[PDB]
Each structure stands twice: as C-alpha cells, then as structure tokens.
Symmetry: C3
Subunit: 90 residues, 3 copies
C-alpha cells in the first residue's frame, strides 16, 4: 500500500530532507529555504529512516535503507553519499 | 497488520508529539510535561513522518502524510495546521 | 515484506541508535563512536518510531512500539528501559 517517508531537518532556516521509498527505490527531496528540489540520494529500499546532526555548520546525515531483512546505512558527510559501517548483527 | 507511528520532541521538558496512521487516518497525541492529550492534527494518511525545529521558543512542525503515491506536507508554525509547499516532483 | 527501522542520534560524536522491527520483535543497534553493538532494547512490535533529547549530557529516549492498534511507549532515562505513560486515547 502507500509510499513510505522519513524526514529530517537542521539549523534555523531550516534545511529539510524528505526520503521516499516507492516501489523499491528511495529518492530525496530537499528544502534549503527557497523551494523544493530533487536531491542526489537514490538507492534501493522498501523502507527508510533517517537521522542527522550538525558539527558546527557541517551537516552529517545517515539514511537506513531496508529491503527484506537487509538494512544498508548511507552516509552524507559533505562530499557525496557513501555506504556506512552499520550492520544488523555481529 | 499494525498502525504506523512517527515521533518528535523539543525543548527540555520535553514536549513530545506522536503521530499515528490507523486505517487511513493520522491523529496526534501530545505530551507537554503533565500528561498525554489529543492534538489538533487530524488528516488522511496511511504513512506518516515528522520533523520539527525551534526558532527561539517557537516550535515549527512538518508532518508528511502519504496515501498511495501522494505525499502531503502539513505545517504547524504557531497558528494552526496548513498545507505546505512540498511536492514529490 | 521488509524490516522497518527508526533512528535517532545525539551529541557531536555522535551516538546513534537504530531500532528494527522484524517478525514481531524490535531490536536495537548502537554506535558510540567506535563501532556498532547490540543494545539492551528488545520488545515486541511490528512498527517502531523513536525520539530522544539531552538534558545536559544525559540522554532520554522514547521508543513507540506498535502491534495491531496498540502502541506501547518505552523509556530510557539512564537506568534501564521502562514502560511509559503514553496511551492512544
């Protein structure tokens, strides 16, 4: 049944990121105070969650994308999306 | 199989808001330090996410409600819930 | 069908907590700056959401676990997980 979303925000503007899982694909929409635009994030998943934090003015984002029982962490640390170290078991 | 929830919080008390999508309706439960009560938010949706931020002591909340492939942003900026500018494309 | 997750983080390290609902169980994976490990949280549910806040350096976490139409709040306030006062009505 419906698409699945996850949202985060930071700062005072604020910036907002909304991730949508739709038919096995996760995409990203972004707001930085003027309007919505399509973000760089595009990875497989049926389910998505997100968290973010600032270090000074630098945003760090973690997106957890799940398909079946496999969850992949995707990391934004200022210079592109990369796969993170997250695993669900030892 | 189950309801679906989304939660946010702010401040030091804190205030908490929990949104639940149940049979196509999203409702809101609120905690401001004393007990839980039903919030003003009531809109259609099968899925919900939320984020919030403070500007000084003023809370701003964004709720993303989805039905099928359609996502609607709902905004709280201190004087009622209003539909936001979010579009998926 | 896929597992369903919820995530929160705090501080500057940061600490991260990822909750996964899988086959009626919600479990927790934790990062405190060195590596991922399995957390203490293990409770029933088909759906999970989370929020957290700091009071100074002390973290407070609220996990909302749902099975059918029943949502249970679980609370971390520094000395184990306890059932919270949340009710839906």
């Amino acid at each position: 049944s419906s698409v699945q979303t996850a949202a985060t925000s930071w700062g005072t503007v604020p910036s907002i990121r909304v991730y949508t899982a739709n038919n096995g694909k996760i995409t990203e929409r972004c707001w930085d105070g003027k309007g919505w635009y399509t973000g760089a994030f595009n990875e497989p998943g049926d389910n998505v969650s997100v968290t973010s934090w600032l270090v000074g003015s630098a945003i760090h984002i973690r997106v957890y994308a799940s398909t079946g029982t496999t969850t992949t962490e995707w990391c934004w640390d200022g210079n592109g999306w990369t796969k993170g170290a997250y695993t669900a078991t030892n």
